[PDB]
Design an enzyme around this catalytic site. Structure first.
Site, PDB file in Angstrom:
ATOM      1  N   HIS A  60       0.855  -1.210   0.000  1.00 55.20           N
ATOM      2  CA  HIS A  60       0.000   0.000   0.000  1.00 55.20           C
ATOM      3  C   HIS A  60       0.891   1.261   0.000  1.00 55.20           C
ATOM      4  O   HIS A  60       1.634   1.530   0.953  1.00 55.20           O
ATOM      5  CB  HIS A  60      -0.940  -0.020   1.222  1.00 55.20           C
ATOM      6  CG  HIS A  60      -1.952   1.098   1.247  1.00 55.20           C
ATOM      7  ND1 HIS A  60      -2.923   1.268   0.285  1.00 55.20           N
ATOM      8  CD2 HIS A  60      -2.111   2.094   2.142  1.00 55.20           C
ATOM      9  CE1 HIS A  60      -3.620   2.366   0.578  1.00 55.20           C
ATOM     10  NE2 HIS A  60      -3.139   2.895   1.688  1.00 55.20           N
ATOM     11  N   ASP A  62       0.895   5.185  -0.198  1.00 56.17           N
ATOM     12  CA  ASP A  62       0.112   6.446  -0.173  1.00 56.17           C
ATOM     13  C   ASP A  62       0.812   7.578  -0.966  1.00 56.17           C
ATOM     14  O   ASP A  62       1.952   7.877  -0.661  1.00 56.17           O
ATOM     15  CB  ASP A  62       0.021   6.902   1.276  1.00 56.17           C
ATOM     16  CG  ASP A  62      -0.815   5.976   2.130  1.00 56.17           C
ATOM     17  OD1 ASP A  62      -1.987   5.765   1.749  1.00 56.17           O
ATOM     18  OD2 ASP A  62      -0.309   5.426   3.158  1.00 56.17           O
ATOM     19  N   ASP A 174      -8.168   1.027   1.512  1.00 59.22           N
ATOM     20  CA  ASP A 174      -8.001   2.056   2.532  1.00 59.22           C
ATOM     21  C   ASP A 174      -8.985   3.265   2.593  1.00 59.22           C
ATOM     22  O   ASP A 174      -8.953   3.964   3.614  1.00 59.22           O
ATOM     23  CB  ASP A 174      -6.536   2.569   2.488  1.00 59.22           C
ATOM     24  CG  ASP A 174      -6.016   3.032   3.889  1.00 59.22           C
ATOM     25  OD1 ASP A 174      -6.484   2.476   4.936  1.00 59.22           O
ATOM     26  OD2 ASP A 174      -5.122   3.958   3.984  1.00 59.22           O
ATOM     27  N   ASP A 311       1.629  -1.342   4.452  1.00 63.57           N
ATOM     28  CA  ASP A 311       2.086  -0.021   3.924  1.00 63.57           C
ATOM     29  C   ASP A 311       3.550  -0.068   3.519  1.00 63.57           C
ATOM     30  O   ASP A 311       4.414  -0.522   4.292  1.00 63.57           O
ATOM     31  CB  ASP A 311       1.920   1.060   4.986  1.00 63.57           C
ATOM     32  CG  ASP A 311       0.461   1.363   5.314  1.00 63.57           C
ATOM     33  OD1 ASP A 311      -0.465   0.636   4.862  1.00 63.57           O
ATOM     34  OD2 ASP A 311       0.273   2.352   6.066  1.00 63.57           O
ATOM     35  N   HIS A 441      -6.890   9.404  -0.764  1.00 66.51           N
ATOM     36  CA  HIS A 441      -7.578   9.307   0.510  1.00 66.51           C
ATOM     37  C   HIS A 441      -6.876   9.957   1.714  1.00 66.51           C
ATOM     38  O   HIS A 441      -7.403   9.867   2.822  1.00 66.51           O
ATOM     39  CB  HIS A 441      -7.970   7.840   0.803  1.00 66.51           C
ATOM     40  CG  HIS A 441      -6.805   6.890   0.876  1.00 66.51           C
ATOM     41  ND1 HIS A 441      -6.308   6.187  -0.208  1.00 66.51           N
ATOM     42  CD2 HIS A 441      -6.035   6.555   1.932  1.00 66.51           C
ATOM     43  CE1 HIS A 441      -5.258   5.462   0.180  1.00 66.51           C
ATOM     44  NE2 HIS A 441      -5.075   5.668   1.471  1.00 66.51           N
TER      45      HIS A 441
HETATM   46  C1  LIG Z   1      -5.235   6.930   6.497  1.00 62.05           C
HETATM   47  C2  LIG Z   1      -4.077   5.990   6.720  1.00 62.05           C
HETATM   48  N1  LIG Z   1      -4.481   4.591   6.646  1.00 62.05           N
HETATM   49  C3  LIG Z   1      -3.306   3.727   6.428  1.00 62.05           C
HETATM   50  C4  LIG Z   1      -2.728   3.307   7.776  1.00 62.05           C
HETATM   51  N2  LIG Z   1      -1.895   2.105   7.822  1.00 62.05           N
HETATM   52  C5  LIG Z   1      -1.476   1.367   9.020  1.00 62.05           C
HETATM   53  C6  LIG Z   1      -0.655   0.084   8.769  1.00 62.05           C
HETATM   54  O1  LIG Z   1      -1.493  -0.845   8.098  1.00 62.05           O
HETATM   55  C7  LIG Z   1      -0.674   2.409   9.819  1.00 62.05           C
HETATM   56  C8  LIG Z   1       0.581   2.953   9.340  1.00 62.05           C
HETATM   57  C9  LIG Z   1       1.284   3.890  10.157  1.00 62.05           C
HETATM   58  C10 LIG Z   1       0.828   4.322  11.417  1.00 62.05           C
HETATM   59  C11 LIG Z   1      -0.397   3.794  11.882  1.00 62.05           C
HETATM   60  C12 LIG Z   1      -1.154   2.850  11.106  1.00 62.05           C
HETATM   61  C13 LIG Z   1      -2.395   4.699   5.675  1.00 62.05           C
HETATM   62  O2  LIG Z   1      -2.175   4.123   4.395  1.00 62.05           O
HETATM   63  C14 LIG Z   1      -3.125   6.036   5.543  1.00 62.05           C
HETATM   64  O3  LIG Z   1      -3.638   6.289   4.240  1.00 62.05           O
HETATM   65 ZN   LIG Z   2      -3.627   4.718   2.703  1.00 54.92          ZN
END
Ligand SMILES: C[C@H]1N[C@H](CN[C@@H](CO)c2ccccc2)[C@@H](O)[C@H]1O
Ligand SMILES: [Zn+2]
Ligand SMILES: *[C@@H]1O[C@H](CO)[C@@H](O)[C@H](O)[C@H]1NC(C)=O
EC number: 3.2.1.114
Length: 1014
Positions: A60, A62, A174, A311, A441
């Protein structure tokens, strides 16, 4: 054409009905915290019926969040892609899926030819597969459907050109909640399957119990089912490895081989992964296969999807090896042990869906039908993600401004073929890519770090400048005699004038038209109308004298009104918020009439005294303790008075009454009718002092909102023949009601300043007997029925308001249309409310790592439409949709796609012409040309132009509304040689059209056509 009003579709799952029946209890389900202990019969699978497992590696990425797009590309994504190319090339059975084409295109263009060829080979052979193929994985709450299509088209056009593939399966793991606008657009763009993940934990539990996680998702008004798209909803809390192998994350975490220590990662459940060996492969396979068989119990076929990723994963070479080798040892053991009756392998997303449909065709499963949406999302307890419907509202409004400028720049320049030296294609590609990137997003959602929000703003500013350049070069070519036209492609022939962006009080950006007897007597201005019907609209310009008159290009006088230029100031000395008038700039206002998808030219001329066809507004400042307000040459002196109630009426329009605090109190539709109570009020929500805190994603109010204390605010009333208004300086908001003869326009200049832990809401209070029902839109495409549920907390009853919302009873309706996406609700019968901004000191534990303390002034815009609906033919009580009236739909178009205004930059325009487009067909009011785009460069022998046509559905309320012309987009350009119906991305031809005529579409349908010209 299907009737979208009178036939309630019959579906197995209708989300509004499901919500009415569900209990939403949050009980501890065991190791699957939000589920139950899954049981299965070991005898279900056997030699003749095995479980086929597809493990699908993914990463994933971003396009901006904690770092900017370019920072993540340099630190992470370029290494992920370079190592994916090496590892897939060297391991033929390994697979990988990729979603974000913005990153892939950034990588591919930097590769040498040898590696470009290696990359094309692993795509052609099926090892690397693109899923969705959009520029980004967009937000589905705040995004407009036109921009979701723009970014999908940007990424798929790049894929067709360079990789020769077009994805037919979508991957959306996501976005925070999901919208049916996605299957609508995807099914009309060639897709056959889609996957989603973030839906309310109570919904995953309910659908899993009935094995309804895979369903045919159709639109809420679709009785026949032709819009249906097969959808797979993932069952668990996250898309990470601990929540994708099965129900127990303490077990699944042991199969994420990046978590043993050397990578700086670990398992929070306290049991680490262990390297697979010949001495432990049997016990590890026993644990893993048990998780797989439990997950398989929640679905209907013998084909199981197991995503393997997180991620920015698959970066290091050592990471590719640790995951691949350990899984290869598990597969070799499992697949050779007959007692498990499992065949497992690495696979892609399309491979999973192809096997599921092979099972369906073999008669092993039938799937349920479903309509509705998946908002508002909660991932645990009362943590509802309704805060991002409002976070960073300045950029949410900027998204809608840029949306319109990209449409107008592509349409104005499509009429001609351009030399490469004009750099038209170059500037349009930059504009489309920066707006497409912001659909991410963590972009339009307002959930990125402060410096990342700055990067998205800078990119969108450059895109606006690109659009302006293309638009003004196009207007100069369209309105200048051909044998005189002499362009310098770097020159500014016209500057754009925009009254609402960034807006008065936000940025002094507008140019004043400078006229004078000793410098320049007159100035040409031009209006563009992107909509396909003739349109009249008041327009305004700043001028250096109040003695100005207007003429059309046949020299016919045009009625005009002059008003002062008023600016509001927070006086830190007197501690009041009050207006100051300019003594050298004035506003001139007049009605412009412009052809369908055309241009109209007017002239502004100075005189030494009041002109015959220009009137001047009166101005009244209401406040105790007034001081003089000089206006230079303006001919009417400002009047003063103590605060008091006032009433205003423009034209034959509605009569509006205001409180002594400058806020609307009632609306009287006609001379005779009653004064219907409609009251505006501003209130504030706070943050909890104990427990979970609101942040960029979450809205966790400390109870119902409290009224903002108003004090004795200063109210300014301007009364004119063409336009009148009431404006008041309230704490954090300059609120303005503007009247031009129809439904008023509301503007709020919102500056939350240093008010920490505060959310400002604008509420409308009426006596309409709406009960617990209200309507909100999805992506500016459709209106869906909402039911306020008192069994859920206040924040769960908040929904996205991407473009409009309304309440109604048997006789009366109140509709609020918006020029920017914000969050809102109806928390009591007769009310509507919409959040303006929010400033939060704390982080909300979703990874952002900061609060929201970077607020800046923003000008929000709206139209407020009160109507009688007792004569309208409306859907029955059981129908899940609602529809706008003609007046409300036109009011929304006035906010999103207003006329564009151009001021000629030099002293004399040689060869000027008066109009363009007088011969374009004026189509029925419910039809729009959403997109007009030339698809070929100037060297193509056969030119091609693409059009996206959308027809909405308006209520029949007894108005005859007749005589309009059929719009055939294939004959808008001359010498047409072929007309084809295509997918919405223009990438596949679906129908060769008879007589080269493009038929109009049905209500709620969207079609694309491409005309070819010799
Ligand atoms: C809103 C957010 N949601 C996803 C969070 N991803 C998780 C790991 O799976 C995460 C990553 C980093 C810190 C806390 C939590 C990110 O890709 C972002 O777009
Ligand atoms: Zn994301
Ligand atoms: C592109 O894909 C098609 C699939 O129909 C194939 O027939 C064609 O040869 C491909 N062109 C290439 C290899 O660039």
């Amino acid at each position: 054409c299907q009737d979208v009003v009178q036939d309630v579709p019959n579906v197995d799952v209708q989300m509004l009905e499901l919500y009415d029946r569900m209990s939403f209890k949050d009980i501890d389900g065991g190791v699957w915290k939000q589920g139950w202990n899954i049981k299965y019969d070991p005898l279900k699978y056997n030699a003749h019926h095995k479980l086929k497992v597809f493990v699908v590696p993914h990463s994933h990425n971003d396009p901006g969040w904690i770092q900017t797009f370019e920072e993540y590309y340099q630190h992470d994504t370029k290494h992920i892609l370079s190592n994916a190319l090496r590892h897939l090339h060297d391991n033929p059975e390994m697979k990988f899926i990729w979603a974000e084409i913005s990153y892939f295109a950034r990588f591919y263009h930097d590769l040498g030819e040898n590696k470009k060829l290696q990359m094309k080979s692993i795509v052609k052979n099926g090892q690397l597969e693109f899923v969705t193929g959009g520029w980004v994985m967009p937000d589905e709450a705040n995004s407009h459907w036109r921009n979701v299509l723009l970014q999908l088209t940007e990424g798929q056009t790049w894929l067709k050109q360079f990789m020769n593939v077009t994805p037919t399966a979508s991957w959306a793991i996501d976005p925070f909640g999901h919208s049916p606008t996605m299957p609508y657009i995807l099914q009309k763009s060639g897709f056959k399957n889609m996957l989603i993940q973030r839906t309310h934990y109570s919904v995953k539990k309910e659908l899993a119990q009935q094995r309804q996680l895979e369903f045919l998702w159709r639109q809420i008004w679709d009785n026949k089912g032709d819009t249906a798209l097969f959808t797979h909803m993932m069952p668990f809390y996250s898309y990470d490895i601990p929540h994708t192998c099965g129900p127990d994350p303490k077990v699944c975490c042991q199969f994420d081989f990046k978590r043993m220590g050397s990578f700086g990662l670990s398992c929070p459940w306290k049991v680490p992964p262990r390297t697979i060996s010949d001495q432990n492969v049997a016990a590890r396979s026993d644990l893993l296969v048990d998780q797989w068989k439990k997950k398989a119990e929640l679905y209907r076929t013998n084909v199981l999807l197991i995503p393997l990723g997180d991620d920015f994963r698959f970066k290091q070479n050592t990471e590719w090896d640790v995951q691949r080798v350990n899984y290869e040892r598990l597969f070799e053991h499992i697949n050779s042990q007959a007692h498990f009756n499992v065949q497992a392998q690495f696979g892609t997303l399309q491979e999973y869906f192809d096997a599921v449909h092979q099972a369906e065709r073999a008669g092993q499963a039938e799937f349920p039908t479903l309509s509705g949406d998946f908002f508002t999302y909660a991932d645990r307890s009362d943590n509802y993600w309704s805060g991002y419907y409002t976070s960073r509202p300045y950029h949410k409004r900027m998204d809608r401004v840029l949306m319109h400028y990209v449409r107008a720049a592509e349409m104005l320049s499509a009429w001609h073929s351009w030399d490469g030296m004009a750099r038209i294609e170059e500037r349009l590609e930059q504009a489309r890519r920066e707006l497409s990137l912001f659909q991410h997003h963590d972009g339009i959602t307002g959930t990125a770090k402060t410096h990342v929000v700055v990067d998205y703003e800078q990119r969108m500013q450059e895109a606006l400048k690109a659009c302006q350049m293309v638009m003004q070069q196009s207007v100069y070519r369209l309105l200048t005699k051909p044998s005189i036209y002499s362009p310098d492609f770097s020159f500014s022939y016209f500057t754009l004038d925009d009254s609402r962006w960034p807006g008065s009080g936000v940025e002094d950006s507008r140019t004043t038209i400078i006229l004078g007897e000793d410098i320049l007597p007159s100035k040409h201005v031009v209006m563009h109308n992107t909509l396909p019907h003739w349109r009249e609209q008041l327009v305004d310009f700043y001028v250096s004298s109040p003695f100005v008159s207007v003429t059309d290009l046949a020299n016919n006088p045009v009625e005009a009104q002059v008003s002062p230029v008023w600016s509001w100031h927070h006086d830190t000395l007197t501690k009041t918020i009050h207006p100051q008038g300019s003594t050298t700039k004035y506003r001139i206002i007049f009605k412009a009439r412009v052809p369908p998808m055309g241009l109209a030219t007017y002239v502004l001329t100075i005189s030494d005294s009041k002109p015959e066809h220009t009137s001047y507004a009166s101005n009244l400042l209401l406040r105790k303790n007034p001081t003089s307000l000089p206006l230079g040459q303006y001919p009417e002196d400002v009047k003063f008075g103590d605060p008091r109630e006032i009433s205003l009426r423009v034209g034959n329009g509605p009569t509006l009454a205001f409180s002594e605090q400058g806020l609307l109190k009632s609306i009287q539709l006609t001379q005779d009718s009653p004064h219907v109570p409609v009251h505006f009020k501003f209130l504030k929500y706070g943050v909890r002092s104990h427990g979970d805190r609101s942040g960029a994603y979450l809205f966790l109010p400390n109870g119902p909102a409290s009224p903002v204390e108003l004090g004795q605010p200063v109210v300014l009333v301007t009364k004119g023949k063409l336009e009148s208004s009431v404006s008041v300086g309230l704490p954090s908001v300059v609120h303005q009601t503007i009247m031009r003869g129809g439904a008023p326009e509301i503007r709020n200049l919102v500056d939350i300043g240093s008010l920490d832990n505060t959310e400002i809401v604008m509420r409308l209070e009426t006596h309409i007997d709406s009960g617990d029902i209200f309507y909100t839109d999805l992506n500016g495409l459709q209106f869906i029925k909402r039911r306020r549920l008192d069994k859920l907390p206040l924040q769960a009853n908040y929904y996205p308001i991407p473009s409009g919302m309304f309440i109604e009873d048997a006789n009366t309706r109140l509709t609020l249309l918006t020029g920017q996406p914000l969050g809102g609700s109806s928390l009591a019968s007769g009310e509507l409310e919409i959040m303006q901004d929010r400033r939060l000191a704390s982080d909300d534990e979703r990874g952002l790592g900061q609060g929201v303390l970077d607020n800046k002034p923003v000008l929000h815009i709206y139209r407020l439409v009160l109507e009688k609906v007792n004569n309208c033919v409306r859907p029955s009580k059981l129908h899940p949709a609602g529809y706008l009236t003609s007046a409300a739909h036109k009011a929304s178009q006035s906010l999103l796609d207003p006329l564009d205004k151009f001021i000629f930059a030099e002293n004399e325009w040689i060869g000027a012409q008066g109009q363009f487009g007088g011969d374009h067909p004026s189509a029925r009011e419910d039809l729009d040309v959403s997109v007009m785009r030339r698809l070929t460069k100037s060297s193509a022998k056969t030119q091609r132009v693409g059009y996206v046509l959308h027809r909405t559905n308006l209520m029949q309320c007894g108005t005859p509304e007749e005589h309009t012309q059929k719009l055939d987009v294939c004959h808008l350009l001359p010498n047409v040689a072929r007309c084809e119906r295509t997918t919405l991305t223009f990438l596949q031809n679906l129908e060769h059209l008879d007589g080269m005529v493009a038929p109009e579409v049905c209500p709620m349908e969207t079609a694309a056509y491409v005309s070819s010209h010799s």
